[PDB]
Design a binder for this molecule. Structure first.
Ligand code: PLM
Ligand code: CL
Length: 133
């Protein structure tokens, strides 16, 4: 399963191309403003086989709980209602969200102790890097 090194409290330290990723998702300017300003905290936890990813920011929280490989309903921070699946590939924790025949991927991997999230929509790529408290 998921490496235990994913578990903990993560703080965003850099973000590349999030505005165009949000545009790709159809997010409007006021909400993009909040997304570009936020320095969220991402807490990854696990109890038995249930993985939880909680995101906290000054103006918005989200939380998902899932089992690997089992599709679940998700309401994203930009209010998309998606069918999502999280899988594990070469130790990368890979989330796919599907809605209205669209899809986006959020792939989270550990690189030299940091968590690197690659977000892709319509081939637009954003990279968000986190360090662990
Ligand atoms: C984090 C909340 C900010 C406020 C609103 C943001 C709305 C855009 C959400 C786009 C999807 C977020 C992808 C985040 C990937 C990650 O965990 O780094
Ligand atoms: Cl914030």
């Amino acid at each position: 399963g998921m490496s235990n090194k994913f578990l903990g409290t993560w703080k965003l330290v850099s973000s590349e191309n999030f505005d165009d990723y949000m545009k790709a998702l159809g997010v409007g300017l006021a909400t993009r403003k909040l997304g570009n300003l936020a320095k969220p905290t991402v807490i990854i936890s696990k109890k038995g086989d249930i993985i939880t990813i909680r995101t906290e920011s000054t103006f918005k929280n989200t939380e998902i709980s899932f089992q690997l490989g089992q599709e679940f309903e998700e309401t994203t921070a930009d209010n998309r209602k998606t069918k999502s699946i999280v899988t594990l590939q070469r130790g990368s924790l890979n989330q796919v969200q599907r809605w209205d025949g669209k899809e986006t991927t959020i792939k989270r991997k550990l690189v030299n102790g940091k968590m690197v999230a690659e977000c892709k929509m319509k081939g637009v790529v954003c990279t968000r890097i986190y360090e662990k408290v």
